[PDB]
Design a protein around this nucleic acid. Structure first.
Ligand SMILES: [Mg+2]
Ligand SMILES: [Mg+2]
Ligand SMILES: [Mg+2]
Ligand SMILES: [Mg+2]
Ligand SMILES: [Mg+2]
Ligand SMILES: [Mg+2]
Ligand SMILES: [Mg+2]
Ligand SMILES: [Mg+2]
Ligand SMILES: [Mg+2]
Ligand SMILES: [Mg+2]
Ligand SMILES: [Mg+2]
Ligand SMILES: [Mg+2]
Ligand SMILES: [Mg+2]
Ligand SMILES: [Mg+2]
Ligand SMILES: [Mg+2]
Ligand SMILES: [Mg+2]
Ligand SMILES: [Mg+2]
Ligand SMILES: [Mg+2]
Ligand SMILES: [Mg+2]
Ligand SMILES: [Mg+2]
Ligand SMILES: [Mg+2]
Ligand SMILES: [Mg+2]
Ligand SMILES: [Mg+2]
Ligand SMILES: [Mg+2]
Ligand SMILES: [Mg+2]
Ligand SMILES: [Mg+2]
Ligand SMILES: [Mg+2]
Ligand SMILES: [Mg+2]
Ligand SMILES: [Mg+2]
Ligand SMILES: [Mg+2]
Ligand SMILES: [Mg+2]
Ligand SMILES: [Mg+2]
Ligand SMILES: [Mg+2]
Ligand SMILES: [Mg+2]
Ligand SMILES: [Mg+2]
Ligand SMILES: [Mg+2]
Ligand SMILES: [Mg+2]
Ligand SMILES: [Mg+2]
Lengths: 77, 149
RNA sequence: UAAGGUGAUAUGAACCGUUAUAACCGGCGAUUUCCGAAUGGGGAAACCCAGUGUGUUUCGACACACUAUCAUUAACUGAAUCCAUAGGUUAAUGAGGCGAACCGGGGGAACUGAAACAUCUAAGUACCCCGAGGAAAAGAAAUCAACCGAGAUUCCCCCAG
RNA sequence: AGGGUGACAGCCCCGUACACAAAAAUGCACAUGCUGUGAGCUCGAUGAGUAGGGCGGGACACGUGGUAUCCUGUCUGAAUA
RNA sequence: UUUUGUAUAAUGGGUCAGCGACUUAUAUUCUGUAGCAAGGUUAACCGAAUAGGGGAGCCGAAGGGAAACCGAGUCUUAACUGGGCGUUAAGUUGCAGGGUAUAGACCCGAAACCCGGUGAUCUAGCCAUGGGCAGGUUGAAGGUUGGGUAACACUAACUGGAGGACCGAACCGACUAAUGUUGAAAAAUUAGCGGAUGACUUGUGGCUGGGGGUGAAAGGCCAAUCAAACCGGGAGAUAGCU
RNA sequence: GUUUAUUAAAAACACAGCACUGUGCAAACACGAAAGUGGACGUAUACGGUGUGACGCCUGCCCGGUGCCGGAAGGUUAAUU
RNA sequence: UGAGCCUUGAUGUGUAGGAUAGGUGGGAGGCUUUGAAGUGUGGACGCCAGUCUGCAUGGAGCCGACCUUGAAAUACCACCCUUUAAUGUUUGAUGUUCUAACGUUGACCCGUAAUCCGGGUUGCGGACAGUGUCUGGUGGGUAGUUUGACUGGGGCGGUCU
RNA sequence: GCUUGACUGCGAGCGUGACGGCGCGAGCAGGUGCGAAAGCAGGUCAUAGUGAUCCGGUGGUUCUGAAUGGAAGGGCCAUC
RNA sequence: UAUGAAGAAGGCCUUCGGGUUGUAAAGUACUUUCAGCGGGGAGGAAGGGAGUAAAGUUAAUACCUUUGCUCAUUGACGUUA
RNA sequence: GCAUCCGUAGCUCAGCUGGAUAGAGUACUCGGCUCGAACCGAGCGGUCGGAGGUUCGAAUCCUCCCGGAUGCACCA
């Protein structure tokens, strides 16, 4: 499903407004993208389904550190 | 996306130069090909250590350069036994090989490659100034003489 | 605990007991067919069809045991592809489903009211989904106060319609 | 207290008030023994793609309103005793 | 019962018996009554506990003004001789009752809206695999053999067996009329009628699910129900109507 | 041939044919939050949609209105800055 | 290739004229081997009037400057504007070429007894496409509703203060 | 002819409306105008020329200002 | 190297009008052969030596010598092409 | 409710692009010539939408309006 493997972002629901404030139910989905991340330690490419916000944290946190949390999370990368 | 260079990628600079660059460049090309590394605390310090370590190598070599220099610069004149010139004209040329052997016996080892015979090839007999390019830039100066055989 | 007793409709029959192995009551065990998470495979539930191994023999067979999937962990093997990795085979554990309400979370109406009807109300109610417990949830101040002070959370009465 | 007994029972019966009872299993609590578990003192350290912000919503009694505060789908992004 | 008006030929009722509709909770106002009285009274809670404790609070004894403020005055205004609102006048807590308010709110009754399920054993379409269509006609293309042409073309005879072809049973349809209309039957029977080798018909399975399906298209059909199925829930929806 | 099973079998629907239009194949389109499937294991001599409705003779005039198609200079104009 | 900006230079007619005086001042200063004026067309711009000025040219001259001009002058110095020529910068606009994200419902290999999927190899495409947030347009495709009353029944007509 | 009373604060007492409201009003205070003065003037011979509340805008205002000083915002006055 | 005419000036001639040098220059873009400097870098290099193991060679295959191999090798020019 | 722009022979428009003073085509008169077509050149037909600010100099720039247009907004 539409779940970020790094940040855990999932679809959320909200309202479409209008000039008359009429509210209709809608969904907000993450900006998910399948990317092949280069992991130096294994000299391999591992593909992850990440959001655009998740991509930013990978540079800041390091590719190895996030995967370590993923193994703790049991996400089965 | 700060990242530390590992080579001279295009115009980005040379090995060891943190520079701000668009994310995509390194996020998928520079790093997965190994041309550079992300500028992180651990990595940057190691590279800065590598920077200062090569600086110490430069220091040490140039330090030992002045060592050889002084060793032989201050006087330390040597003379070689060349077939009696007989009223002048020496019976042979004094080449880099022969002159290097002379200083080497004195102790200050010098390879003929380094030797640079200025303004001649030591043709006459008697005293004749010389020079040695001890380092890549440092210039020296030695007096060398010739006598009987 | 006992002089009576073999459940009921429900008699009868044939019997069992009477001073303690009748019966009855309780504790602890044993047995517990088939279907059903159903788990050897399949299936129109209570049926059909096996495989492996141990042990039996009257040489026709027979009796037990094991064989689902997933998660976790550890071994062994094992691609493209040299290592590896994916993958694969075992072995251990654990989970599966059911159940009233209460609880947390993910979704989430409309009728109705507004004397119509869009914002609003109904209502985060009904309902659906996920998870847990005997309670759950919350919880140990980046909280309030107001220049005085209070000192986690939860619940009740006020404050106050 | 009640119930039953051939019509309305304190003394007919079963009970009731009180006084007692467990081979075995089990709850609870105290004590105690093992198996883990670490108490105290000093010096440090003090939660960053986070707070905050832009956009779109939601939650706070509070419907965007001059609207604090909380949660964030999106885009950014600090200080750090 | 409803009406200006009903013996009315307006509605209701075959009869009896049973059941069947102004309630409850909370708050508020008014009346009655009881207690205390410029005071009255506690709530939660504690409590051997309908006691007692608990005065946290609530109402009242002071109002005027938007408010700051002032105060038996106050506001208005620059100011009022003014004017507005107040100042002598007992309230409060129970109990009962009359109203009001929120709840289904005196009872019964919608057509519907929304949510979650159940239905293609009927029917519609489609899919797979099987079956059925007596008998009798008409005689296409093509073919052969002649006749004709330089060769065809063309023509004749004979073979052939084409067709959403013909007549007509099974089968399938359902046009007319009569009967039937408390039916033999919640759509049929009798006598006739159309198709009847095909866009046919049928058996057994399968698939499409409700704002959806399916539809050679009638708003038809989707379990005797269809301009939005059925079942349960919201739900005692709402009903200025009877 | 088909149709209102259960008051309407028709001149209604379908029909072969005709024309317009979309569609270059990861096709258009449709069912699906999506994956995917149908279209089609087809490829413009194909497929979808629309109207007309064998055949015969024919199908004239209007682009102002409303759509559609083409153009892009100018006018106007959102988020953003 | 636009453009905000970087600095420099340069630019300036009412007329009258002293006229290449934009305006605004100070302004008898100005002037000066540093090359007196200066020759050589140095050109540009501009009134094409004129002006500064590229390197040499020669050797003491050089200049405020009345009628007029609003003003008094490219004598003069300071300060602005206009005109702006170039200069870097900062943002964009296209176009071209790449690969490395991304796409592949191209080929090949493996997982594998597999027209799924995944991995690998390769080709093609490629910073597009596609997707997310925001946003303009369109949108009976699909919803929720409105669409008055009086009235010799209603509608139509008329009326509503 | 001269002027701005088409005045400001008020208002005894009345009229007419279910109400919202509408209408009439001497006189009082402060400042005016015209008259020499008595006096008259709170628009027009009278009766039509009109639209509540909410929301928002403008000016004024020691009313308020969510710890305090401000401010925002609100209130009041004038007014759209 | 190209642009570059006001056919610069200057030179010389002059029919005193000119021409001639001559796009030559200046100027303006442009490039850095070699020579300046710096930093790399073949080839000439075959060899034998040391070892090894086998083979031929023997009384003993000791001795050798033949293979293969293994390690380390050598450039005067030469601051080489 | 603002913001911007436009207004010139009868007409259609240059605006004499922002001060050192109005142009064309068409309308019409005359003429050239010529039966009309059809052709040409002169002439005529404007105080520049109006009113305030300027300076020596504005139809042209500033203020104010009038009419027109396009924009915005927008919920008494
Ligand atoms: Mg089984
Ligand atoms: Mg309503
Ligand atoms: Mg438990
Ligand atoms: Mg912390
Ligand atoms: Mg943030
Ligand atoms: Mg927000
Ligand atoms: Mg507001
Ligand atoms: Mg509001
Ligand atoms: Mg707020
Ligand atoms: Mg009567
Ligand atoms: Mg009657
Ligand atoms: Mg009746
Ligand atoms: Mg009372
Ligand atoms: Mg009490
Ligand atoms: Mg008190
Ligand atoms: Mg008073
Ligand atoms: Mg009452
Ligand atoms: Mg009631
Ligand atoms: Mg037929
Ligand atoms: Mg027939
Ligand atoms: Mg027929
Ligand atoms: Mg039916
Ligand atoms: Mg419906
Ligand atoms: Mg129902
Ligand atoms: Mg309800
Ligand atoms: Mg009801
Ligand atoms: Mg027919
Ligand atoms: Mg019918
Ligand atoms: Mg039929
Ligand atoms: Mg019929
Ligand atoms: Mg037709
Ligand atoms: Mg047209
Ligand atoms: Mg058209
Ligand atoms: Mg509709
Ligand atoms: Mg509704
Ligand atoms: Mg009516
Ligand atoms: Mg505050
Ligand atoms: Mg060179």
């Amino acid at each position: 499903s539409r779940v970020c493997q790094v940040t855990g972002k999932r679809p959320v629901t909200g309202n479409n407004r209008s000039h008359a404030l009429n509210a209709t139910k809608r969904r907000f989905l993450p900006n998910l993208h399948s990317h092949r991340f280069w992991v130096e330690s294994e000299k391999r490419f591992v593909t992850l389904r990440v959001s655009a916000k998740g991509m930013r944290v990978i540079d800041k946190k390091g590719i190895d550190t996030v995967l370590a949390e993923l193994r703790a999370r049991g996400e089965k990368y | 996306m700060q990242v530390i260079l590992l080579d001279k990628v295009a115009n980005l600079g040379s090995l060891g130069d943190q520079v701000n660059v668009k994310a995509g460049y390194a996020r998928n090309f520079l790093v997965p090909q190994g041309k550079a590394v992300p500028a992180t605390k651990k990595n940057i310090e190691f590279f800065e250590a590598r920077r200062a370590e090569l600086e110490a190598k430069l220091a040490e070599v140039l330090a030992a350069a002045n060592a050889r220099a002084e060793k032989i610069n201050a006087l330390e004149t040597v003379t070689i036994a060349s077939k009696a010139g007989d009223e002048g004209k020496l019976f042979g040329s004094i080449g880099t090989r022969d002159i290097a052997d002379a200083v080497t016996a004195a102790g200050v080892e010098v390879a003929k490659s380094e030797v640079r015979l200025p303004n001649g090839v030591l043709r006459t007999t008697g005293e004749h100034e010389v020079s040695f390019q001890v380092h890549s830039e440092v210039f020296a100066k030695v007096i060398v003489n010739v006598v009987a055989e």
